Write a protein that holds these residues in place. Structure first.
Motif, mmCIF file in Angstrom:
data_model
loop_
_atom_site.group_PDB
_atom_site.id
_atom_site.type_symbol
_atom_site.label_atom_id
_atom_site.label_comp_id
_atom_site.label_asym_id
_atom_site.label_seq_id
_atom_site.Cartn_x
_atom_site.Cartn_y
_atom_site.Cartn_z
ATOM 1 N N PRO A 192 0.816 -1.227 0.000
ATOM 2 C CA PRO A 192 0.000 0.000 0.000
ATOM 3 C C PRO A 192 0.848 1.274 0.000
ATOM 4 C CG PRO A 192 -0.797 -1.564 1.668
ATOM 5 C CD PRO A 192 0.583 -2.064 1.194
ATOM 6 N N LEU A 193 0.348 2.315 -0.657
ATOM 7 C CA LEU A 193 0.931 3.645 -0.498
ATOM 8 C C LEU A 193 0.428 4.221 0.843
ATOM 9 C CD1 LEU A 193 2.513 6.132 -1.528
ATOM 10 C CD2 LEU A 193 0.356 6.865 -2.690
ATOM 11 N N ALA A 194 -0.810 3.877 1.222
ATOM 12 C CA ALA A 194 -1.342 4.299 2.525
ATOM 13 C C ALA A 194 -0.481 3.701 3.635
ATOM 14 C CB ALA A 194 -2.795 3.860 2.696
ATOM 15 N N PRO A 220 -5.245 1.979 -5.612
ATOM 16 C CA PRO A 220 -4.203 2.659 -4.816
ATOM 17 C C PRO A 220 -3.040 1.734 -4.424
ATOM 18 C CG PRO A 220 -6.369 3.354 -4.101
ATOM 19 C CD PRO A 220 -6.599 2.218 -5.070
ATOM 20 N N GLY A 221 -1.846 2.311 -4.396
ATOM 21 C CA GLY A 221 -0.654 1.623 -3.926
ATOM 22 C C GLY A 221 0.117 0.939 -5.047
#
Ligand SMILES: *Cc1cc2c(cc1C)N(S(=O)(=O)O)[C@@H]1C(=O)NC(=O)N=C1N2C[C@H](O)[C@H](O)[C@H](O)COP(=O)(O)OP(=O)(O)OC[C@H]1O[C@@H](n2cnc3c(N)ncnc32)[C@H](O)[C@@H]1O
Ligand SMILES: [Cl-]
Length: 418
Positions: A192-194, A220-221
């Motif tokens: 993940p980018l989160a 995302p990611g």
């Protein structure tokens, strides 16, 4: 026999104006050809995606493919002297047989040494310099046909390796080597980018000798993480993403048989550093490429800028690869003077669709002092581009000294030297 041939780059998106590729079969012929030609550019293995090799109408396009390709290892000195047309596959094979090795390789081994270092070619790894960084000497056939040799320690050397071919024809280069070493390649899916905060990002990119992230900029990611670990260094656990269940390719859907061995099976450095096995020998590729090289401290901010426009990037994207490069001494290296994060894009081969996306991406990266890879597609305006290189004037002085008439300056280079 004497009819016009069409000469292109590797991907075929660039068609050169040259109606013949001159391939002198002796150094004497090459010196005479250079001396006697008004404007010259050299073609390597054609793995650039823009007009860098284009000599303009009436300009001569020449290759070293007609000269013997020599790879001369001095085991005691730990050096290798290689012809500028030699490709990394062969260079690596020969040095490995002598018990020696390079500290890095690019993703695909079938690319010329001189052509690679001319543009700032690199692999990954936070402590790994560009491919040019191991060169200790270059031998140039200059505009009047005479040889100039420039070695590390010479005040000029900083402009002599990554020179966009603007100083002359690099007939040979000498590179420094280290003892041969073993590596394991471990692939993971879904990072993940989160929550990829400064500490985690640093940990991830430093988790092995060479680390890459891949993404499609869709969900995302990141889709993949590739760890190329030296067996003579520790491998800690890597909790951040799931271990890959299958052999992987950088581009989803493309054949993983093309890629170097994974699942952490040990093998020699030169069979692990590239993403692509030596046996994989494509004569062309249906792709375009861009890459942006930024101060490593801007990694997360840049990644977040890209994430914000991911819907714009994805439709024309085959894969995006994130890498690191150690600060380069070469004045024109996109990694000049600063530890670097690189964001590479392998695009669908659709120039009209890709160019607007490239422009949007470049706009997004302006706040992060992004320098484009000289061998790839970019649209950064010439003046803005010149401003990104602290030692550009020093480079222009060097080019002026070695090539006062600009025999080796084409439209591409002229925009840089302006
Ligand atoms: C096609 C391809 C390109 C690379 C990658 C993968 C393949 C499929 N990747 S990527 O990750 O997919 O992007 C590479 C990577 O892992 N790391 C990189 O930094 N770059 C990637 N590239 C890059 C490609 O490496 C280059 O852009 C190169 O410049 C390597 O060069 P080539 O020799 O193939 O290119 P050209 O023939 O176009 O020449 C480039 C410039 O250098 C000159 N030149 C060539 N020979 C000489 C000599 N003997 N003397 C002086 N100048 C020389 C040309 O004039 C031209 O300016
Ligand atoms: Cl995420």
């Amino acid at each position: 026999f004497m009819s016009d041939i069409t000469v292109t780059n590797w991907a075929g998106n660039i068609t050169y104006t040259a109606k013949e590729l001159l391939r002198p079969h002796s150094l004497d012929a090459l010196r005479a050809l250079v001396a006697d030609s008004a404007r010259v550019r050299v073609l390597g293995s054609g793995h650039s995606f823009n007009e860098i090799a284009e000599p303009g109408d009436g300009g001569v396009l020449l290759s070293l493919a007609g000269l013997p390709s020599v790879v001369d290892v001095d085991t005691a000195a730990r050096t290798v002297r290689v012809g500028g047309g030699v490709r990394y596959a062969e260079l690596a094979r020969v040095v490995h047989a002598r018990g020696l090795a390079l500290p890095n390789m690019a993703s695909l081994p079938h690319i010329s040494v001189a052509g690679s270092v001319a543009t700032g070619t690199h692999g990954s790894g936070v402590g790994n310099g560009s491919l040019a960084s191991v060169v200790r000497e270059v031998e140039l056939v200059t505009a009047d046909g005479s040889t100039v040799v420039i070695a590390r320690g010479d005040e000029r050397f900083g402009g002599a390796v990554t020179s966009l071919g603007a100083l002359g024809v690099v007939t040979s280069l000498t590179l420094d080597l280290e003892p041969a070493y073993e590596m394991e390649q471990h692939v993971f899916t879904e990072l993940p980018l989160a929550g990829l905060d400064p500490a985690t990002f640093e940990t991830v990119m430093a988790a092995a000798y060479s680390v890459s992230l891949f993404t499609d900029w869709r969900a995302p990611g990141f889709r993949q993480v590739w760890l190329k670990r030296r067996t003579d260094r520790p491998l800690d656990g890597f909790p951040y993403a799931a271990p890959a269940a299958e052999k992987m390719h950088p581009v989803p859907g493309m054949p993983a048989v093309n890629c170097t061995e994974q699942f952490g099976v040990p093998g020699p450095w030169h069979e692990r550093l590239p993403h692509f096995r030596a046996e994989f020998t494509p004569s062309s590729g249906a792709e375009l490429q861009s890459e942006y090289l930024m101060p490593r401290e801007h990694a997360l901010a840049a990644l977040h800028a890209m994430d914000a426009i991911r819907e714009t990037l994805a439709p024309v994207l085959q894969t995006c690869e994130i890498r690191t490069v150690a600060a380069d001494a070469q004045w024109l290296s996109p990694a000049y003077g600063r530890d670097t994060v690189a964001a590479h894009f392998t695009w669908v081969e659709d120039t009209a669709a890709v160019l607007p996306v490239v422009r949007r991406l470049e706009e997004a990266l302006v706040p992060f002092a992004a320098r484009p890879h000289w061998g790839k597609v970019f649209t950064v305006p010439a003046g803005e581009l010149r401003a990104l290189y602290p030692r550009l004037a020093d480079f222009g002085a060097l080019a002026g000294a070695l090539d006062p008439a600009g025999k080796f300056t084409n439209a591409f280079v002229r925009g840089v030297l302006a």
